[PDB]
């Protein structure tokens, strides 16, 4: 019938788990109104820059006649931004019922200072949801007793219509809607420290990467391209023995090239010793800890926590055959080598087949990366004094009730046999896009992210406004792998992010 | 729209915890008339001296379909104060079930002596809410079994119309509400 | 020809092409004249209101001239009018004297 | 105004560059009704199923007052397909001038079978253009003389209205349009056979290529998923010497390990020869060709057109050090090495450090890839003799006056410094797609694709039904390499790509 069928039926939104443990007075629905909602509106929206009137919202909960509780209606003007309090409620409020079958459906009608919308005005009327009265439940008892879901909908309202055509081309002004960062799909994700494909999650407190990571306004901590490629850098044959200490050859940060590893040795050890033990072999899983015992040790081997790498030698003048490569970041005062932990365009050391005492200088090219040095079961960046900083340390604490993640990847070694991992802040493709890209998210609206396995486990992830991954458990475990994701929007930070995990 | 957007909605004023073990017969909102019930009037009224009409009172509760229960209303005249006996309800009452998930919404007449209101006059119309029926729960046994909330809110009735505005500065002759301590 | 809205600002790209677009031929004796319609977010734009409705013209095929060959072959030039829409009237009117908030037109330096 | 601006605007589509060098009948626009055309309708459609009516077209040419020449208007009725031949205007037409400076705009009727048009029907009306007669030019002469555009633009007829609303979610049947393959954006684009980024075009005769290839129908001549990750082999300790095949341990294609490299060697060569020499260090670049001279030589070295890669050695049951990994796919019959050009689960060589005869079993584990072995200026997979087939050998000749192209990547070699290249035949992000994803493409009509530099430089690309690269140039040369792409749509591949190079 009419061109406009979508102006007419009801687009789902999101939905909430309420909880028969969740306090009295706690928000549910942050949401505002603009086109930013409805996806059809928001799609269309792409082909003007004017928007007005308001927007429906049908939505309900599925109670049972047993239960008994009551939630409450406020339409939020623009300007203000409601807190998580009672006194929201000393407002001109809606009460609403669990058992209600029958789904609300009102409207949040725009006041607007202006005549009509800019496209990107983030400060409009805005309505919410808040639990006035506690979910009871005749049966109480023990664990998280139960708790329904409740659903948001939604219809572009009568009186709301765009207003100014733009013209095709004329770049956007502010920014695409972020829910276009994780790919969904577990398949292509890989780690932004290291090329490997994410294949497990980790439940931290503290996060920090400067390396390779993203900022929202496009700005980076970091010192190197969103991408993995081999670093090549050149190094002035030292005539004595190894050397290290080799300046960049094409890189976008002075120096520090572009895509050299992340942390530095953690003691002042030195460049030496062949296959430098730390013991048994063939004795495979004795070991992991402390050693073990007198006799199998856990580690040492000099050269440890060094970053393997194959490797291309130059040649200069001349002599063959590359050999090497084994390094980090640190100060290469005489045979020594002391971790540094500010890095600069002097600390990046190698080792080599340097050779012949004429001094024949400027020896390497290139070296990739390989592996690790086996510090016992250290997922590589768990510790702010082994990861290095530019100058700044980019991290995020335990924001709102929510927990900061980290990727668990993996890192093949080397003496050993094959084996340990590493964590990772963003998913790779983020990073990619943060830099190639430009969004709007409210510094206290993460980026909901839905995440399920291939029973029925699912939970959330959000987006820090500086670009972290948070959740809403204190523990998640085991779960299918072959994991494929999706996009919600924005939620305040404020709200955990309800998952049925476990 | 209307300059007075509040002389149509809602505003919350108070809720009660109803519970399982209380006894038949008990008060529950003493509540009554003056615009020092809800707090725009409450707050508009200091600007005026005379007041008169009525409020209408919307209030709910949110039982399960399981509990079993019966509320009483009943709008108190001037001059007499309720007591938490049963007797109240040998008066004209409106029954009231906790299974209703529609919210009430009656209004509390302005019966009076005078013609406007004194600003002060504490001696009006009321009305109030007593449990008629105990509050019946299928899985009883030990500890304060359960017992579910019930709100109230308010919305100056038509009828409600001021009438004397005074003039700014002209001390008031009695005393603001005490909800400032 | 094309309008581009406000909050946008033109790439001298080919991509602003695939936008609505009205062409334009040089042979066309006849001056074009048409309208930049003004898209608003307010009701009355502010004197200083730098962000509003916008056109451009952009190349889309190249000058061709049957006698090519060396240096800078040739190329005519092209003129622009204007004239105050009908729908277009002020509204506010200042007192004198009350500074003005933004800063003149720099074309007196 | 109306909330359907697009319906009422001309939105543009192609053009086209009409040479004086085109004989008299010639197609240019084998353009076909469905919302297809115009992109807004394209995305609309997105919601539907339904779709009836017609479609303006507008579109003209700039011709100078000088010119002369007329151009041909068809209306060809659903079910045929017209030919670049003459005859094709002893039907009703209308004549069209070059001097014409009013766009002409008329309409194709939608003549149907059914009553609503299924999305997919790729059988209805069509339009197109002709050149009725040459284009003449008062100062002809010697080269291509001149010749200007075509423009044409697209506006939704009045009379075409959709109809079914499709519900969303309910996967479309049918498959999305192939304009978004390439990336738009020179950088991320690296070769299929290779990790590399592209920097440079190869303009050639024939194309063939498996590994990693991808057709259109989904399907693969191929034997390995479309990414580059680590390959694990599992060999059996020979006792003696080196050994060579190991079956794989988790690949999509039974014994053939997904990832294993493309060619093989050229000739029955051996295992051995340390440093084998190909004469001359330091004597850079006095080397191309047949070894240049005498004393100076170009190829040799043993085990040349060798696979290097890094490798990670398993141990067994014990003894260390990774150490060497030199691939290929061949028969391993005694301590030779004959080539094999059909691949199975009988041929994968490699080098190592077996070792001790106690016969100990099944080494290695994995190995990446880093070079290959300098057999001069062969970039590598330019002759049929050294691809490596499953059993099919996919091609692509001269279609139409378009030429195949591949992507001159870049491979580093060993016992030289640095240098020698590869080709490739699909942008791998391309191949990611096809196997990802399910388009429909005419077998007739590539896949239009615009490539520009820095300056002003740009041509076209087109994409094979089986999914290769053509290009309308006899050849291409150096441009500015900040390169960006785009899609335009389909072309009967009948019709060259016109492109502002050279």
């Given at each position: 019938s009419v061109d406009s069928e979508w102006e007419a039926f009801f687009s789902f939104h999101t939905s909430v788990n309420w909880s028969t443990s969740e306090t009295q007075g706690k928000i549910l629905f942050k949401q505002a109104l603009g086109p930013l909602l409805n996806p059809y509106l928001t799609h269309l929206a792409k082909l003007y820059v004017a928007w007005s009137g308001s927007i429906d919202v049908r939505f309900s909960i599925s109670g049972s006649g047993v239960f008994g509780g009551k939630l409450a209606a406020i339409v939020v003007?623009?300007?203000?931004?409601?807190?998580?309090?009672?006194?929201?409620?000393?407002?001109?409020?809606?009460?609403?019922?669990?058992?209600?079958?029958?789904?609300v459906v009102f409207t949040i009608p725009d006041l607007r200072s202006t005549l009509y919308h800019l496209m990107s005005d983030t400060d409009t009327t805005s309505l919410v949801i808040m639990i006035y009265n506690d979910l009871i439940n005749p049966y109480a008892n023990d664990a998280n007793s139960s708790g329904c879901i409740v659903t948001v909908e939604?219809?572009?309202?009568?009186?709301?219509?765009?207003?100014?055509?733009?013209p095709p081309g004329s770049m956007l002004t502010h920014g695409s809607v972020p829910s276009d960062l994780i790919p969904k799909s577990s398949s292509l994700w890989i780690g932004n420290r290291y090329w490997t494909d994410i294949t497990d999650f980790v439940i931290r407190p503290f996060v920090f990467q400067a390396n390779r990571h993203f900022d929202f306004n496009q700005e980076t901590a970091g010192?190197?391209?969103p991408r993995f490629r081999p670093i090549t850098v050149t190094i002035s044959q030292k005539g004595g023995e190894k050397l290290g200490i080799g300046i960049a050859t094409d890189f976008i940060v002075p120096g520090i090239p572009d895509g050299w590893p992340d942390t530095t040795i953690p003691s002042k050890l030195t460049p030496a010793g062949d296959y430098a033990v730390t013991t048994s072999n063939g004795t495979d899983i004795t070991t992991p800890r402390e050693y073990d015992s007198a006799n199998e040790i856990v580690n040492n081997t000099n050269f440890k926590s060094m970053y393997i790498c194959g490797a291309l030698q130059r040649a200069w003048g001349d002599k063959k055959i590359s050999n090497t490569a084994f390094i980090t970041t640190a100060t290469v005062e005489g045979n020594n080598l002391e971790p540094s932990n500010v890095i600069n365009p002097t600390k990046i050391a190698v080792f080599q087949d340097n050779h012949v005492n004429r001094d024949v200088q400027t020896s390497d090219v290139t070296l990739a990366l390989l592996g690790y040095t086996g510090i016992g079961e250290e997922a590589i960046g768990a510790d702010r004094?082994?990861?290095?900083?530019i100058s700044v340390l980019p991290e995020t604490g335990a924001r709102g009730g929510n927990h900061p993640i980290f990727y668990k990847n993996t890192?093949?070694?080397?003496?050993?046999?094959?084996?340990?991992?590493?964590?990772?802040?963003?998913?790779?493709?983020?990073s990619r896009q943060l830099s190639l890209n430009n969004y709007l998210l409210p510094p206290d609206s993460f980026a909901v992210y839905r995440i399920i396995?291939?029973?029925?486990?699912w939970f959330d992830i959000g987006i820090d406004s500086d670009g972290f991954?948070?959740?809403?458990?204190?523990?998640?475990?085991?779960?299918?792998?072959?994991?494929?994701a999706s996009y919600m929007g924005i939620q305040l930070a404020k709200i955990r992010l309800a998952s049925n995990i476990r």
């Open positions: 003007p623009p300007g203000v931004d409601p807190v998580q309090s009672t006194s929201m409620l000393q407002y001109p409020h809606v009460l609403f019922d669990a058992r209600q079958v029958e789904p939604t219809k572009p309202g009568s009186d709301f219509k765009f207003h100014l055509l733009k010192w190197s391209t004094d082994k990861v290095v900083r890192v093949k070694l080397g003496y050993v046999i094959r084996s340990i991992d590493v964590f990772n802040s963003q998913i790779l493709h983020t396995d291939a029973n029925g486990s991954s948070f959740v809403g458990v204190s523990n998640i475990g085991k779960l299918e792998f072959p994991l494929s």
